[model samples]
Target: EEILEKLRSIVSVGDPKKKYTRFEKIGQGASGTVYTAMDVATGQEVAIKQQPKKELIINEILVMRENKNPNIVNYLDSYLDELWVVMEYLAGGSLTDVVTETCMDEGQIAAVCRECLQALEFLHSNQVIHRNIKSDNILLGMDGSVKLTDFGFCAQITPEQSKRSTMVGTPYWMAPEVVTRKAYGPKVDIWSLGIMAIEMIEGEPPYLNENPLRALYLIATNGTPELQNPEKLSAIFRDFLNRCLEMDVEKRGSAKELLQHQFLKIAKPLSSLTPLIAAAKEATK
Candidate 1:
């Protein structure tokens, strides 16, 4: 397959760490810095996620390799470091940037949500859980592509039954079960997507005013947090959000079901999001 060839082209022999040329640092976070790089042999643009922790890096590579879908960022190769995952370079940066820097109409939000839900559906079918799902992990491409990235906290659900009990994911976006340290499954990602939807709409998550620790505790105890102002969103979106943010884990709907909901069904063409992506990039400059 062409994809396999692309992956093989990036694999190196000598040094194993000298195949690519690192260029400008595009983004940085608590764990790592993502640099725009050139694959010397293939002469292709790539994004390198350089992390210091071997566990984090390896886990991401493993998870990414297992779940390959168009809506998910492509994992092209890995380098010999704690973890350096080479992926397709996304020019539009994180959706978090867009949420904070630009105003989005309902169509744009619906487009993004649909893409994310599609990605989540693929992962869940593969028995994987993207423990962390938020705007920060969603990247946009100049060609109107919306892809999910960052698999550091992603895990595989057991074959027999699905239940992951770990206190992972950003606090404000964390599901009640996740914050409570109770067993959760694919629906956790759905909950985070709901928070992301809110973030895209209102420019921040539910507990923006509170400290992270307090927010985590509140999420664990408060059931489902009400939307800051439910009236701002359409009835269909509010209904979709309610399905995603259901306090009772059993009551929460799956990504596949949410994709068929009327709100997502009404989403405009993915190409329609290009202008917003351009606006977001302009703000970053």
Candidate 2:
């Protein structure tokens, strides 16, 4: 456990929030910034999520503490100051890194889509809804496997609350029902998955009008995101995606149903995610 040792050297038994200089800034957003921190004790690396907004800060440290899955990012330590979450540092960056300009093949896309759906199924089966799923939200390791991270709006669905009214997530990836503030349950995530599928194929949102208001108008009056073409993906992929973006939540496919789609039955399923990281690298090269 090289990582474990590094973590020990940097963090003491009682104090786990010590900042090491070797750490690097990785990703940043409106809520907070993520930095790669080094553990001098064990040489282990971790992601330190720094958030200042009280409303944005969360107890992800508590929720992810017991989670153990190769498909989910690991949490090593946490320290709350203004806003912070010290998590496992996933190398190789995000899916957006490799899959730019659409370098993924159909088989690869299916592989990634399937495994990711499996991860979603695992979460949904436990009554947890990620609420937000996107190409950027996924992180890829060097092995080409994918891990779903970023619990920005994770919540357990109750029988009484069939849908979430809180409108959150990247504007481009939101589903039609969500955009219109319609009643939607966990199926909202399915809609996001459908949007991500389009991102993989088209390298852009399904409806990209010139302005944000225009885009909102398109989402409201234009109905669901109709994929004119879903190349490098199977027919089931189209159907499942169609279901996720259903204007009516009643018509959307559950995460469990989407997992069974034929599009996801491929080898090394995260191979599709490989392209996003590759694209990110190519940009630097």
Candidate 3:
């Protein structure tokens, strides 16, 4: 296939048996299995995702090759054949792990949001859309770094085709325009970011208890969701979420615009997340 050919041209087209030593299985999903490995040459830990040669795997590699940001996962090397993607190992686990096991203060939440926004801004400026922008896709490093991962649903928009009509993304994080099957742009990521913010605050999304299909229906019908305790949110944070969750696509704030929001002033250093990550790991143990 042409995609396979392109991949072969971009990455090594053979097994990586001599370069890395695969250890424990760190994660697994429908797409692939991730293993924590040691780079033979550098003696550094890395995460390798082994997946079948699928279009999505190809897409992820291509997109990752195009991006380089501190808040974005670092793509090391990739091997063709059966499709092996090598990336930086974030020992701090995922944002989902932290959110599920520990509580975050407003400052901590703002810090996480700021890092994600930085990645989104870089992606949007490059005409790329991270169609899947949920906490589960956000990973952390023990060294106080937060990065965005999982590019399987990412899409690139060119001048000739400025809008995306594909109905993709997680149900709870799906924007109304997306669930309704209307054409959308990068602002869809902003909406999902807002939903993620809500998730961080409430410990779940708006329709967490509903069926996935019903959640999509509710999201399309529900203009804006009210927080469980709006009074607890600072005015600036509330305003930031309002801008992100705006139903009107044209009115929604872009990642760049949101970066200037006042709520970000309260964001603590990235290192502040280290304690939380440690606590989450302890809870899991």
Top-TM-score candidate index: 3
Model 1 per-residue lDDT tens digits across residues 1-285: 554444345444455347777577876868677788887888988887662334555456667777889999999877543446678998877898889888887887888999999999999999888988999899898877899988878888777867878899889999988888888888999999999998988899988899999999888778787776778889998898899999887789899899999998778787887888888778877
* Worst window of 10 by summed lDDT in candidate 3: 49-58
Point to the candidate with the largest lDDT.
3
lDDT for each candidate structure: 0.83, 0.67, 0.89
Which stretches in model 1 have alpha-carbon errors above 4 Å? 1-22, 39-43, 51-53
lDDT of 3 by residue, 1-285 (tens): 777676677786555777888677977877667899897778999998873546777788788988989999999899853567889999998888788888899899999999999999999999999989999999899987999998988889999997888789999999999899888999999999999999889888899899999999999888788898999988999999999999999999999999999999999998899999999899989
- Per-residue error (Å), model 2, residue 33: 3.7
Deviating ranges (above 4 Å) for candidate 3: 51-53
On TM-score, the stronger of 1 and 3 is 3
Tens-digit per-residue lDDT, 1-285, candidate 2: 453334334432444445454767877776567787777777877778762333223335444654556678876665543445677676767766555554666666676677677778877776677877988878778667777887757766777774676666666677666677767567777878877877766766666655766776777687776666656457766665677677777777787777776666644445445556666777856
What is the lDDT ranking, best to worst? 3, 1, 2
Clashing pairs in 1: none
Indicate the residue-level lDDT of 166 in model 1: 81
Cα displacement (Å) at residue 111, model 1? 0.8
TM-score of each predicted structure versus truth: 0.89, 0.81, 0.94
